[PDB]
Design a protein around this ligand. Structure first.
Ligand code: GAL
Ligand code: GAL
Ligand code: GAL
Ligand code: GAL
Lengths: 427, 427
């Protein structure tokens, strides 16, 4: 298909997944979206070290299995996250050092992979082993202190435990090619491939924001690692502000690299995010598709004035007034400011620069007007490929009242029927 | 003075107040802002009918007195809210009707006003007595069904109980002069003045949103009522989106009417608002001043390129770049799009139409750059009258690194110091 992210990604042999929290599976609003849109799942915390081995040698897969069962019951594949990591270690392991820690690491890998043997598509075997101090060197942790070869040992151990799973190294801030961290990871992978250390993929977490923005050279970064003979994947994607352009850009970067397996966004709704304050996901708290959602779907599927097809007239602001509450209408198209609409990354349709197409309600017949831009979901719109314009908050379509076609026809919100008075083209 | 809203309003003999909730008087962040910025207080709920007379004849002023005492002790006058209303009536009063209710109303008025006798500046004697159906007639309530003269009776009763207080009629959706409800209220007040009914003021709640937007004819409404011989007051002001222009417009409308006693915003921080979702107030959840705050203060105190005062150079985006993460600099001024910034009502400094001046952090030395506009507080700024530009989230000033003045001097956030490398002039 091409109406859901997962199905659209499958059209190019890829997947589109999300992170699932077992504690939210009882929320039908959560699961409805999750089961429908994604075909790949990562347990947000259920498969971490502290959750799977609470006490040394005593494994517990109850939380992890709830996530796994849900995934398979709903036709999704699973990424295992994560086997060796300096963070979120259970108390007993934090107390270990030297050879004792090294063996415990090995035992943990064998224990967790044995339970899920043959059931996991990808495993983040080692997570975040590199430093952020700009040296491009290893992060200092109890694991690194057991010996520089700890990462290699983790991978060799993993391959023996379950040779059916793809083994990935996973990290953040390794997307921009110019960073020392990115290059430090590249050299490690190169070394591993030349010495025969088993590693099949590199996961780029892809947590983008103002302090660590997406950069177009990310595509060369992906190509460079791919050239080493490993697959690559975007594993924990989220973008501060959820810019439609940036979300579409990241998607196209993966689509340009044959070795890019797929994309996983780190969560379902903004409110489920570990960084909810940054509204970095594709669905808002209400479970509504955001503007970025449409941008991603359109990219996966291959992808001024606004005139209605059924009337041939343009979206117009009466008498070119700038008064809040002025309802918009259809009118003879002519290059005039009151007919110039700018679609922003946030999904707004701006006029006069600071006025926004505004929905004064969420029900059928709601008046569509202009109002000072402030960022509300009632000022957010999704421009579907079928030519329809849907309001993020209401889920309703821009509709020319009564199918009218003459000048003065008013614009409202109405159930989407894909009628001709609901289709628009940008010129 | 002129550094706080209350003091700035007092310069013209007016006041600037807020609604206080007794439940928050324990929050030091709440009280710090409230005691400092306002010189007028309205109890948000504590003086309502259900709060002051839980059981017929049994009066309770515990919560009301708590708000009143805090107000007076901190130098603020108080508006009483409210004596007669169809909403929030206690259980027992909802059952009454006919003369029984009329008497209950009278007793309540005498009871409440007797307790606060001579301590209240203004009383909202009657609240929201008109309909929103569009007819411009009385609202059908248990009070109205006791006799069309109940309002008159309430005002006559109130005057006798405490002749020192100004008696106001309070309502919403009566700001736009062309509305039928506005006309209904007007006709009533005009009638009351002719027949000697004691009414001293008319309160305009001023709850503006895209459903009932601010209109410039609000000033005309205020002047028309003032012409009848009554004072006017903006009693529960909040604006969906908190547009800087609209907040300034409302403030100026009051300053342009000699009988406009003052303005009361319905709450302190957005998180304290009954409509927090609309972020309609002057301070955000963090308690920091919003862009609209500065606009209001500037209005009360009387009343493109961004050029650095100390350097004579302009805020410039290097090579007219549009990539996120690009740090801005100082450069010889010249009419180019990468030097034209638009200050939006939301408080953003936009360039290229959809890129925002962005702070990648909150501490000193934080890099100031451009990033996709998404509405974060790190993309909001306050243009102070002194020439400084302060980040809303950080409370820090735009600063030309090391006081540099040559082309290429980078911009950062830094503790405000009133230095020339921190003062700007819009051209
Ligand atoms: O319908 C009134 C008309 O007023 C004109 O000034 C404007 O250019 C037209 O686009 C239309 O708005
Ligand atoms: O009432 C408004 C509606 O009227 C219908 O006749 C029309 O087909 C819809 O698209 C919408 O315009
Ligand atoms: O120093 C870089 C300069 O590059 C120029 O192309 C631009 O017009 C200047 O405003 C400045 O950005
Ligand atoms: O190092 C940064 C600081 O350098 C100072 O010389 C300057 O006065 C400050 O405003 C700030 O720029």
């Amino acid at each position: 298909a091409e109406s859901t992210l997962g199905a659209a990604a499958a059209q190019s042999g890829r997947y589109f997944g999300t992170a699932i929290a077992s504690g939210k599976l009882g929320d039908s609003a959560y699961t409805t979206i999750a089961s429908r849109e994604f075909n790949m799942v990562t347990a947000e915390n259920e498969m971490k070290i502290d959750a799977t081995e609470p006490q040394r040698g005593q494994f517990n897969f109850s939380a992890g299995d709830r996530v796994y069962n849900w995934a398979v019951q709903n036709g999704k594949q699973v990424r295992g996250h994560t086997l060796a990591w300096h963070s979120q270690q259970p108390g007993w392991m934090q107390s270990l050092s030297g050879s004792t820690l090294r063996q415990a690491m090995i035992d943990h890998i064998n224990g967790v992979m044995g339970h899920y043997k043959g059931k996991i598509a990808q495993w983040d075997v080692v997570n975040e082993a590199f430093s952020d101090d700009g040296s491009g060197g290893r992060r200092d942790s109890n694991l690194q202190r057991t010996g520089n070869d700890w990462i290699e040992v983790a991978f060799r151990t993993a391959r023996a435990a379950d040779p059916a799973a793809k083994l990935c190294y996973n990290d953040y801030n390794i997307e921009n090619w110019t960073w020392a961290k990115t290059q430090g990871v590249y050299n490690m992978v190169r070394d591993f491939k030349q010495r025969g250390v088993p590693i099949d993929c590199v996961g780029f977490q892809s947590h983008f924001n103002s302090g660590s923005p997406y950069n177009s050279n990310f595509r060369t970064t992906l190509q460079n690692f791919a050239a080493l003979g490993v697959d690559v994947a975007i594993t924990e994607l989220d973008i501060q502000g959820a810019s439609s352009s940036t979300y579409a850009a990241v998607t196209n970067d993966c689509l340009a690299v044959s070795r890019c397996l797929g994309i996983t966004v780190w969560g379902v709704r903004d409110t489920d995010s570990w960084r909810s304050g940054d509204t970095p996901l594709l669905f808002n708290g209400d479970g509504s598709k955001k503007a970025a959602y449409t941008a991603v779907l359109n990219a996966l599927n291959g992808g001024g004035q606004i005139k209605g097809v059924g009337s041939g007239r343009c979206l117009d602001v009466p008498n070119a007034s700038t008064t809040d509450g002025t309802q918009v209408q259809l009118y003879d198209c002519h290059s005039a400011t009151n007919q110039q609409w700018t679609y922003t990354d946030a999904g707004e349709l701006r006029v006069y620069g600071d006025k926004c197409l505004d929905a004064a309600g969420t029900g059928n017949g709601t008046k569509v007007q202009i109002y000072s831009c402030w960022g509300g979901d009632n000022q957010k719109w999704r421009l579907n490929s079928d030519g329809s314009i849907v309001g993020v908050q209401s889920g309703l379509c821009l509709d020319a009242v009564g199918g009218g076609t003459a000048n003065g026809t008013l614009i409202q919100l109405y159930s989407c029927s894909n009628g001709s008075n609901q289709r628009w083209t940008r010129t």
